[PDB]
Enzyme design. Structure first.
Site, PDB file in Angstrom:
ATOM      1  N   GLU A  27      45.579  25.260   2.847  1.00 21.88           N
ATOM      2  CA  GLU A  27      46.153  25.645   1.564  1.00 21.88           C
ATOM      3  C   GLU A  27      45.719  27.047   1.145  1.00 21.88           C
ATOM      4  O   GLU A  27      46.532  27.816   0.642  1.00 21.88           O
ATOM      5  CB  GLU A  27      45.781  24.644   0.460  1.00 21.88           C
ATOM      6  CG  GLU A  27      46.483  24.966  -0.868  1.00 21.88           C
ATOM      7  CD  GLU A  27      45.871  24.269  -2.063  1.00 21.88           C
ATOM      8  OE1 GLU A  27      44.634  24.316  -2.197  1.00 21.88           O
ATOM      9  OE2 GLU A  27      46.632  23.701  -2.872  1.00 21.88           O
TER      10      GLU A  27
ATOM     11  N   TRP B  47      51.269  19.216  -1.317  1.00 19.69           N
ATOM     12  CA  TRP B  47      52.292  19.828  -2.167  1.00 19.69           C
ATOM     13  C   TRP B  47      53.689  19.196  -2.074  1.00 19.69           C
ATOM     14  O   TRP B  47      54.597  19.580  -2.809  1.00 19.69           O
ATOM     15  CB  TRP B  47      52.399  21.328  -1.876  1.00 19.69           C
ATOM     16  CG  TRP B  47      51.319  22.151  -2.523  1.00 19.69           C
ATOM     17  CD1 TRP B  47      50.119  22.503  -1.984  1.00 19.69           C
ATOM     18  CD2 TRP B  47      51.352  22.712  -3.839  1.00 19.69           C
ATOM     19  NE1 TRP B  47      49.397  23.259  -2.888  1.00 19.69           N
ATOM     20  CE2 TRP B  47      50.135  23.401  -4.033  1.00 19.69           C
ATOM     21  CE3 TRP B  47      52.294  22.701  -4.873  1.00 19.69           C
ATOM     22  CZ2 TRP B  47      49.833  24.079  -5.229  1.00 19.69           C
ATOM     23  CZ3 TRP B  47      51.999  23.374  -6.061  1.00 19.69           C
ATOM     24  CH2 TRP B  47      50.779  24.052  -6.226  1.00 19.69           C
TER      25      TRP B  47
ATOM     26  N   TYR C  73      50.957  29.710  -7.450  1.00 14.79           N
ATOM     27  CA  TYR C  73      49.794  30.471  -6.983  1.00 14.79           C
ATOM     28  C   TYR C  73      50.000  31.664  -6.045  1.00 14.79           C
ATOM     29  O   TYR C  73      49.816  32.809  -6.457  1.00 14.79           O
ATOM     30  CB  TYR C  73      48.780  29.520  -6.346  1.00 14.79           C
ATOM     31  CG  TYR C  73      48.324  28.413  -7.261  1.00 14.79           C
ATOM     32  CD1 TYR C  73      47.539  28.681  -8.387  1.00 14.79           C
ATOM     33  CD2 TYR C  73      48.670  27.089  -6.998  1.00 14.79           C
ATOM     34  CE1 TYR C  73      47.107  27.649  -9.223  1.00 14.79           C
ATOM     35  CE2 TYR C  73      48.249  26.059  -7.820  1.00 14.79           C
ATOM     36  CZ  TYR C  73      47.467  26.341  -8.928  1.00 14.79           C
ATOM     37  OH  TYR C  73      47.035  25.300  -9.708  1.00 14.79           O
TER      38      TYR C  73
ATOM     39  N   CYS D 226      46.859  25.201 -12.386  1.00 15.53           N
ATOM     40  CA  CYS D 226      45.700  24.437 -12.835  1.00 15.53           C
ATOM     41  C   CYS D 226      44.494  25.375 -12.724  1.00 15.53           C
ATOM     42  O   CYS D 226      43.754  25.540 -13.695  1.00 15.53           O
ATOM     43  CB  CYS D 226      45.527  23.189 -11.971  1.00 15.53           C
ATOM     44  SG  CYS D 226      46.973  22.105 -12.068  1.00 15.53           S
TER      45      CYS D 226
ATOM     46  N   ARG E  43      42.121  25.171 -16.309  1.00  8.22           N
ATOM     47  CA  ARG E  43      42.616  24.655 -17.594  1.00  8.22           C
ATOM     48  C   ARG E  43      42.654  23.138 -17.730  1.00  8.22           C
ATOM     49  O   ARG E  43      42.555  22.604 -18.826  1.00  8.22           O
ATOM     50  CB  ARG E  43      44.029  25.164 -17.872  1.00  8.22           C
ATOM     51  CG  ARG E  43      45.068  24.433 -17.039  1.00  8.22           C
ATOM     52  CD  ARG E  43      46.478  24.701 -17.486  1.00  8.22           C
ATOM     53  NE  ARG E  43      47.441  24.209 -16.506  1.00  8.22           N
ATOM     54  CZ  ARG E  43      47.948  22.980 -16.486  1.00  8.22           C
ATOM     55  NH1 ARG E  43      47.601  22.096 -17.408  1.00  8.22           N
ATOM     56  NH2 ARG E  43      48.820  22.646 -15.544  1.00  8.22           N
TER      57      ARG E  43
ATOM     58  N   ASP F 125      41.205  16.858 -13.018  1.00  6.05           N
ATOM     59  CA  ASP F 125      41.035  15.442 -12.729  1.00  6.05           C
ATOM     60  C   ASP F 125      39.701  15.472 -11.979  1.00  6.05           C
ATOM     61  O   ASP F 125      39.641  15.820 -10.801  1.00  6.05           O
ATOM     62  CB  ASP F 125      42.159  14.966 -11.805  1.00  6.05           C
ATOM     63  CG  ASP F 125      42.039  13.504 -11.440  1.00  6.05           C
ATOM     64  OD1 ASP F 125      40.901  13.029 -11.259  1.00  6.05           O
ATOM     65  OD2 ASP F 125      43.086  12.834 -11.312  1.00  6.05           O
TER      66      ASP F 125
END
Length: 264
Positions: free
Chosen positions: A58, A80, A94, A146, A166, A169
Site C-alpha cells: 500500500e 481497498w 491519498y 483518515c 482524524r 478504529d
C-alpha cells in the site's frame, strides 16, 4: 505495544458511548497523542499477529501516486476493494494528493518531492508537510482521508514525523497505521542519510467498536513482546524506487492473531 495497549485501556476507561455512520456503536475519546522512538524497534503490534505484506504494498502504491487498485490487485492486496468501483478507481485519494495535488491554475503539486527537497536543503523548516486533506476534492474521493496530514522534523541527525489521524478504529486500523508511517520514516531517513527519530501519532475521534470489546480485553491480557527490527536490504536511488523485497522484519515474536468482525 505498551503505548498501544495503554490507548486501548484509555478508550475503555474514558470513552463515551455513541455511534459510527449509523451502524455499530462505539466507545470514543477525542484527542490523543503517543510517541514511538524508532531507535527502540520497529512498532509492529506483538499482542496479536500482524503482517507487513499489505502495509508495504500500500505504501509503495501511495508513493507512486496512481489511485487505481490494479497494482494492489496483481499483488493480492485487497484492503481497498471495498471502496473501488467497477474500473478499480478510488478517486483522488491519498496517492493523488501526495504526488499530484491539483491547483486551481492547472498545476499538480508533488508534496513528496517537495518534502525531500526541504529535508535536503532546509531541514530546519517548520513546514515540511504533506496533506491529503484537499477540501476541493473530498466529494470525488471514495473515502475522505483518515491519515490526513503529516509533518517531518530533523534534530541531532534524526528524522521524526507526526501524523494527524482524524478518525481511528483502535482495534482494526491503528496497528496497520502505525507500522505504515514508521516504514515511511525509515525510507525517508535512508534517502536523507539520517537516523530514525520518533514517530508521533496524534488522533482525533479515536474509538473502539462495540463488537470488538471481547477482542480488546483478550489483547489487553497479553504481555507485549520485544519489538522487531526493520531491515532494508537495499538503498534505492530515490523514494520512488523501493521494491517489496527490499524490506524484512527480524525478531518478530507475536501472540496469536485476533479476527476483527465488522458489520455491513
Amino acid at each position: 505495544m505498551k503505548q498501544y495497549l495503554e490507548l486501548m485501556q484509555k478508550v475503555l476507561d474514558e470513552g463515551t458511548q455513541k455511534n459510527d455512520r449509523t451502524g455499530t456503536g462505539t466507545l470514543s475519546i477525542f484527542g490523543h497523542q503517543m510517541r514511538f522512538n524508532l531507535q527502540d524497534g520497529f512498532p509492529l503490534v506483538t499482542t496479536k499477529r500482524c503482517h507487513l505484506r499489505s502495509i508495504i504494498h500500500e505504501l509503495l502504491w501511495f508513493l507512486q501516486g496512481d489511485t487505481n487498485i490494479a497494482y494492489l490487485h496483481e499483488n493480492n492486496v485487497t484492503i481497498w476493494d471495498e471502496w473501488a468501483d467497477e474500473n478499480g478507481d478510488l478517486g483522488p485519494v491519498y496517492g493523488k494528493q501526495w504526488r499530484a495535488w491539483p491547483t486551481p491554475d492547472g498545476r499538480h503539486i508533488d508534496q513528496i518531492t517537495t518534502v525531500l527537497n526541504q529535508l535536503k536543503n532546509d531541514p530546519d523548516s517548520r513546514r515540511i508537510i504533506v496533506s491529503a486533506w484537499n477540501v476541493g476534492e473530498l466529494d470525488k474521493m471514495a473515502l475522505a482521508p483518515c491519515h490526513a496530514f503529516f509533518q517531518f522534523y530533523v534534530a541531532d541527525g534524526k528524522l521524526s514525523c507526526q501524523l494527524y489521524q482524524r478518525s481511528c478504529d483502535v482495534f482494526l486500523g491503528l496497528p496497520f497505521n502505525i507500522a505504515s508511517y514508521a516504514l515511511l520514516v525509515h525510507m525517508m531517513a535512508q534517502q536523507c542519510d539520517l537516523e530514525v527519530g520518533d514517530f508521533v501519532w496524534t488522533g482525533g475521534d479515536t474509538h473502539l467498536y462495540s463488537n470488538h470489546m471481547d477482542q480488546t480485553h483478550l489483547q489487553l491480557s497479553r504481555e507485549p513482546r520485544p519489538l522487531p527490527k526493520l531491515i532494508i536490504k537495499r538503498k534505492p536511488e530515490s523514494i520512488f524506487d523501493y521494491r517489496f523485497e527490499d524490506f524484512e522484519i527480524e525478531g518478530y515474536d507475536s501472540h496469536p492473531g485476533i479476527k476483527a468482525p465488522v458489520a455491513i
